Symmetry: D2
Subunit: 261 residues, 4 copies
């Protein structure tokens, strides 16, 4: 089986990578970073995001797995002391897989650009104010005036979505959640305020009102897009597959990351 | 087909009820409040809650429908001017049905009591403080100290769940959402703070820490339960069936109820 | 100088009290609980609240001081190991005093009752819903429909006021803060939502709309008042005087109580 | 008495300006934009901010007044129909003045820059993450990791400060309020979360942790500052003086702007 390993780049993560490579060398496993089948991230959830985004074209062929060299992450949720136990059961195979839904983000121009997000996708204003019309299934819902909006995946609800008052939902719920950023609500302007959770096949469209330029963000990426006609949010048809070798529940992961561990 | 009609009790709702009854009299429809098949609520969502709770034993045999004599409700979402058009297509039949998930609430004693909620179920403290341990799938999640907790259905997220900062989710998502009420978070006490959305078959259990008495609430009902051993929350296996005769989306209903109409 | 000591009642707080009494016995200090001049609370902020409320008629004659036998409190903010150092400088005198503003709460009937609050005063509903009209300086401000309201002192902003999203203000600011409890905001009902901070001489009046019965709360007290005509909130003309023997800033106290210590 | 008038620039605001100028021409009033004594803003609160900032060197010599050609503003709080009545009582004089506190913002480099804010001052991150240490009266309070912070004046609490969950305080309270922007709070990172209200002479200092570049904002201004050593917040010694010719309470202004009018 083909495999590759991504490291954060510091001292402990590079040394743990060369130890797993030497450990994989004692099995029929080829190190291939072009067309792998198991992608291992050593470092943190940020190191996991980069590993996901550089192989997002082969998502239905990869089983991801995360190793945190620092504090517990939600994707890098396996301690470095479990690496030598990890390489064996990965080499034998016969493991199980769990899948998390993804978020498709479409941007139209006066061309079209499609992105895939594991955590969330963000839209801010480029300098001046931020005003957009929110369309839900071709039905105008609200005129949002604030700092920006955030559409997050279920697994991304623990990330920047949480800091915006959003709710935490289990990654088995194939849905997406929209949150607001310092919305202006007065006697003339009105926003819903509450976060919105949309099921599959529900299309949330953002449409400009004046400025056609927005700082559009996808996970770690953040690019200023010019002359935007509409931004289209919906649950992606593609999923990310995790290699399941143990029982680490999602509410378990939330407990250790925010309550204490 | 058997039918019955519930009225709020005021002047306009009782007169609209006797007009539909006389309208149903021109078809093969029997007024039966014991074992109906179509239950019509005239008044508001509160009038709808009472109609749902007095027929919750026959939920898989009833198709509900709501008529609001006041402002737009989320279950009573049909104007009184559409009553004479409503009685016809209900009498002919051949309509469609939509189903919303429900919330089962189990209470154990040192006996057992099971309830069904359309909006939300609430747990408060009886006089003194409120302290409970939160268990998610037999895993202790947090020690909550505050005013209380609220577990709401998807359709109930627009109700009291919204006032507690909770998120609004589409009623097609078979799930439940837990929110907090003025939780105490200091350097020693710690709550998650964010709302939690649980999928089906996920059991959220509340367990006492000192006082075994709590003001347990289910929709409009609110009863003080004594010597409670645990409170068990989970998505109910039963659904509520609505008679669908027109296209009134859920995000449509949210727009007219909180943005403007 | 006359003095008295209040204890929480457990083992360590009663033993620390008898040690200070024996320590005070080596000076010209009389133990007098009728007309004291120094009131010492051993236990926590709750033990401090009881000591304040049983001597609220002599507030301009008492210098309070708090000793926490448990975690750091905001009024009981002196460790038990500093008791033997505390009794000396209190016996000699020549210390300094700091004063915190208080909250006067007036309730009218169809009689009148006036209370004094150190933390906050709370108004809830007795069974049914909670609807009141909010009057600010004889000007109607809003029709509040929710669970209740909370008017807190500056020193009380770290208490239940904090759990309701309210702001923390330094106790030198002679003011009061109003917060909301799960307010209903739709297309017809509208509340301000944000907390409100009122200066001195500003009178906030609550007026019923249907039910004239409310669960009125003052610090630990919580009494159901019948046939209430209006509730009147304003900054009290009386202050609580603390015995200052060391430098423990307020933002210091907030840091150790919510960040870490 | 010397005077000048600022207009938003559109059709109705320029025509109302030339009518007041012709109205002032019937009195002993000289139009002087260099060293005025009465500054009139025609348009909105944004038009008022520009008028305040271009005369902030002569704040103790100017009495400001605002005329809103659109919806009710908090500084432009006088309808255009009251202009001809406004010019007379301003020409006669013998009016009264009210003063609102201001916010001094100091920025040090490895030089120094001092700004004055009428609404709020904002600190964001330049590209990457935002991490600062919060110092209150030379005491480290917290390590803030989020989108940014906002320190607002009392009159500015109704502006961007309100959108961040902050409290609304009366402009007679000489203080300042700090709010957070999507703070990250986990098991290792910890922020206070609640807004903080600081009295006069209280110095809140922000200190970098990695990036020394921040998008610093003062009212409408927003400038990227390089190699910042610390940002210093405190209540300014200077006040802004309003020309009081009528009774328009602050809670009055809040009611008409957020409840309804
Ligand atoms: N879903 C997430 N939950 C919690 N923390 C997250 C998440 N995504 C990212 Br990126 N982080 C921070 C990465 C840690 C530094 Br390598
Ligand atoms: N899910 C709900 N969304 C909105 N309003 C609601 C809901 N449930 C109830 Br009860 N109300 C108030 C009933 C109106 C007075 Br008849
Ligand atoms: N202002 C307050 N800040 C923080 N905690 C408080 C406050 N008032 C009270 Br009561 N508590 C709890 C008392 C501890 C158990 Br003896
Ligand atoms: N303190 C403030 N309260 C409310 N609205 C405000 C405030 N400051 C400004 Br700028 N705006 C918007 C200006 C309107 C467009 Br000319």
């Amino acid at each position: 089986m083909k495999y590759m390993i991504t490291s954060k780049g510091d001292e402990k993560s590079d040394l743990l990578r060369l130890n797993m490579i030497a450990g994989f060398g004692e099995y029929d496993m080829e190190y291939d970073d072009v067309e792998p089948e198991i992608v291992i991230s050593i470092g943190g959830d940020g190191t996991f995001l980069s590993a996901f985004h550089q192989y997002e074209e082969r998502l239905d062929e990869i089983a991801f797995i995360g190793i945190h060299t620092g504090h517990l992450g939600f994707y890098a949720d396996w301690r470095p002391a479990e690496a030598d136990k990890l390489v064996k059961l990965l080499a034998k195979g016969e493991y199980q897989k769990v899948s998390y839904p993804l978020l498709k983000t479409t941007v139209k121009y006066g061309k079209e650009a499609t992105y895939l997000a594991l955590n969330e996708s963000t839209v801010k204003s480029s300098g001046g104010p931020f005003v957009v019309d929110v369309v839900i299934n071709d039905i105008h819902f609200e005129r949002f005036r604030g700092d920006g909006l955030c559409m997050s995946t279920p697994s991304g609800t623990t990330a920047y979505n949480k800091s915006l008052g959003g709710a935490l939902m289990h990654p088995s719920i194939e849905a997406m959640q929209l949150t607001e950023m310092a919305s202006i609500n007065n006697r003339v302007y009105r926003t819903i305020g509450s976060p919105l959770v949309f099921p599959k096949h529900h299309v949330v469209s953002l449409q400009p009102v004046n400025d056609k330029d927005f700082q559009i963000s996808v996970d770690h990426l953040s690019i200023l897009h010019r002359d935007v006609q509409e931004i289209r949010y919906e649950v992606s048809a593609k999923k990310i597959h995790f290699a399941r070798f143990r029982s680490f529940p999602f509410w378990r992961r939330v407990h250790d990351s925010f309550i204490e561990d």
